[PDB]
């Protein structure tokens, strides 16, 4: 029966598939931490400024 | 007709690194091309043609294999007078040799 | 002889294994870019806005 070689077909792509897929979970995840440490530090920034701008009052 | 012929489980598809193509033989020379589809190109599986049915003149097989070996496999197939005839199981196509067979013969009468 | 195909494909199927972690290292090389793109447009034209206000 066909399914000897259809199998190792099968069995290549859904290794690709998988690999494929970890890597575009990673990148979804890797843009929302993008947006939450931005959010500290551009927090960070407006605290120096202000201390600053508090000083020069 | 592919309609008469075609059915999903003969079929590798829906896949970034697989293909199925299809291939027409004489009835002598398909004696030969049960193992000679194999020589064709470079990353072909053995164990991979599964005909969809055998007639009179000739056999209709689907081969399954990986996407590389494509196109090397289907210019040297024609080059050793193996007939591609690529449908990757065309449910629109299929559907409309039915559909527009049955609405003809309707039509006309 | 079909089990001289069989070590054959067995060797060159490795292949597709490698475009697939080639294709997922380029979607990981993507992310670590678009990270730091994202991040650095994001922090410094909002950072700019900031001191303008201050």
Same mark, same amino acid.
């Given at each position: 029966?066909?399914?000897?070689?259809?199998?190792?077909?099968?069995?290549?792509? /859904?290794?690709?598939?998988?690999?494929?897929?970890?890597?575009?979970?990673?990148?979804?995840?890797?843009?929302?931490?993008? /947006?939450?440490?931005?959010?500290?530090?551009?927090?960070?920034?407006?605290?120096?400024?202000?201390?600053?701008?508090?000083? /020069?009052? | 007709? %592919?309609?008469?012929?075609?059915?999903?489980?003969?079929?590798?598809?829906?896949?970034?690194?697989?293909?199925?193509? %299809?291939?027409?033989?004489?009835?002598?020379?398909?004696?030969?091309?049960?193992?000679?589809?194999?020589?064709? &190109?470079?990353?072909?599986?053995?164990?991979?043609?599964?005909?969809?049915?055998?007639?009179?003149?000739?056999?209709?097989?689907?081969?399954? %294999?990986?996407?590389?070996?494509?196109?090397?496999?289907?210019?040297? &197939?024609?080059?050793?007078?193996?007939?591609?005839?690529?449908?990757?199981?065309?449910? !629109? !196509?299929?559907? &409309?040799?039915? !559909?527009?067979?049955?609405? %003809?013969?309707?039509?006309?009468? | 002889?079909?089990?001289? +195909?069989?070590?054959? @494909?067995?060797?060159?199927?490795?292949? @597709?294994?490698?475009?697939?972690?080639?294709?997922?290292?380029? @979607?990981?090389?993507?992310?670590?870019?678009?990270?730091?793109?994202?991040?650095?447009?994001? +922090?410094?034209?909002?950072?700019?806005? @900031?001191?303008?206000?201050?």
């Amino acid at each position: 029966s066909q399914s000897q070689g259809i199998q190792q077909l099968l069995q290549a792509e /859904k290794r690709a598939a998988e690999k494929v897929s970890e890597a575009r979970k990673r990148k979804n995840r890797r843009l929302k931490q993008a /947006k939450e440490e931005a959010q500290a530090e551009i927090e960070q920034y407006r605290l120096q400024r202000e201390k600053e701008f508090k000083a /020069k009052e | 007709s %592919l309609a008469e012929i075609v059915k999903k489980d003969d079929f590798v598809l829906d896949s970034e690194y697989l293909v199925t193509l %299809l291939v027409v033989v004489p009835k002598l020379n398909h004696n030969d091309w049960i193992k000679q589809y194999e020589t064709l &190109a470079e990353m072909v599986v053995p164990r991979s043609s599964n005909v969809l049915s055998e007639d009179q003149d000739s056999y209709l097989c689907n081969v399954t %294999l990986f996407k590389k070996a494509v196109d090397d496999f289907r210019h040297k &197939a024609r080059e050793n007078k193996f007939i591609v005839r690529d449908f990757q199981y065309n449910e !629109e !196509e299929m559907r &409309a040799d039915k !559909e527009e067979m049955n609405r %003809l013969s309707t039509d006309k009468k | 002889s079909d089990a001289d +195909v069989q070590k054959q @494909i067995k060797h060159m199927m490795a292949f @597709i294994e490698q475009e697939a972690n080639e294709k997922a290292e380029e @979607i990981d090389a993507k992310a670590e870019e678009e990270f730091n793109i994202e991040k650095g447009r994001l +922090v410094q034209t909002q950072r700019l806005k @900031i001191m303008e206000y201050y």
